[PDB]
Structure 1
Amino acid sequence: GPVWRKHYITYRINNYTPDMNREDVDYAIRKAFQVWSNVTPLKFSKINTGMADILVVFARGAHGDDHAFDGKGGILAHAFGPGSGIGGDAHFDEDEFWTTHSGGTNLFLTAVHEIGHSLGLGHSSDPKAVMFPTYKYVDINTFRLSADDIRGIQSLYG
């Protein structure tokens, strides 16, 4: 499938969930990109205006693509693989309650998984992988990519 053919990738946070402090949104997303830049040649920079490669949106229900959200629960987020326009973009369901910890749905973990899609990864069958389809909280300091995630991403980049 598609991959980014350049090393400098930009992101932009389109809007912010009212679920969290702004600074904590910024931090979660930044740390989630770092997970991936740690194991690839990629570099990620946040921009505040203009077209970014990866636009980070919080939205509910029908939100302008063919991938409507479903209210609280179920689908938490989705992202598009590498490509121009909507390609790369990561969308998070505002009907979830996003958090820094275990209380609702952890933004960091979810963002790691979505950014993996944004980079070109599909789902893993390994329950230990961040690219496994099902959300399960793990302490956000205990978190590591699985071997399977690392193989997947390095098979695409690096």
Structure 2
Amino acid sequence: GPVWRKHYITYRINNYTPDMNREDVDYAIRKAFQVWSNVTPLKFSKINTGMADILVVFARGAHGDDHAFDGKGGILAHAFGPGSGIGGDAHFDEDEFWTTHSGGTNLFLTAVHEIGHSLGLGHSSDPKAVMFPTYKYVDINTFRLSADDIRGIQSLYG
């Protein structure tokens, strides 16, 4: 499928969930980009104005794309594959309760998976994989990409 054809990719946090401290959102998203930068030639920078490649949005219900959120539970987040405009953009359902920990829905773990999609990855059938379709909490300290994820992103970049 489509991939970014450049090595420097920008993101921009369009708005912040009131569920968390600002700095914890910055840090969760940062760390999630770091997971993918560790295993590709990509570099990610946060920008604050202008157009970024990857816009990070917290939104609820119908939010102007053709993919409405469904209130609490069900769909947690989604993201569009690489491309201009909405391409790359990662959207997080505000009707979830985002956290740094095991409570509600972990921002970090979720953003690692959605970013995988922003990068062009689809879903893995391996329950060990971060690209597995279902959200499973794991200790954010114990977190690793599976062989399958690494293999999938390396078939796309690097």
Using the size of structure 2 for normalisation, the TM-score is 1.00
- Would you say how many aligned residue pairs link Structure 1 and Structure 2? 158
Runs of 4 or more above 3 Å deviation? none
- Give, in angstroms, the shift of residue 147 of structure 1: 0.2
- Give, in angstroms, the shift of residue 58 of structure 1: 0.1
Structure 2 residue matching 1:58: 3-state secondary structure:
strand
- Give, in angstroms, the shift of residue 141 of structure 1: 0.8
- Give, in angstroms, the shift of residue 49 of structure 1: 0.1
Find the aligned partners of 2:133 and 2:75 in 1 and give their Cα distance: 10
Listed one character per residue, the Cα deviations across residues 44-90 of structure 1 (whole Å, up to 9, x for unaligned) are 00000000000000000000000100000000000000000000000
Listed one character per residue, the Cα deviations across residues 104-140 of structure 1 (whole Å, up to 9, x for unaligned) are 0000000000000000000000000000010010000
Structure 2 residue matching 1:78: 3-state secondary structure:
strand
Structure 1 residue matching 2:11: 3-state secondary structure:
strand
Query: Aligned residues: percent identity?
Result: 100
Find the aligned partners of 1:139 and 1:102 in 2 and give their Cα distance: 7
**Are 1:135 and 2:135 counterparts?**
yes
Find the aligned partners of 2:51 and 2:2 in 1 and give their Cα distance: 19
Structure 2 residue matching 1:44: 3-state secondary structure:
strand
- Give, in angstroms, the shift of residue 43 of structure 1: 0.1
For 2:19, the equivalent position in structure 1 comes to 19
Over the residues paired in the alignment, what is the CA RMSD in angstroms?
Answer: 0.2
Structure 2 residue matching 1:154: 3-state secondary structure:
helix
- Give, in angstroms, the shift of residue 96 of structure 1: 0.1
Find the aligned partners of 1:88 and 1:135 in 2 and give their Cα distance: 20
Find the aligned partners of 1:98 and 1:145 in 2 and give their Cα distance: 21
Structure 1 residue matching 2:56: 3-state secondary structure:
strand
Structure 2 residue matching 1:28: 3-state secondary structure:
helix
Unpaired stretches in structure 1, ≥5 consecutive residues: none
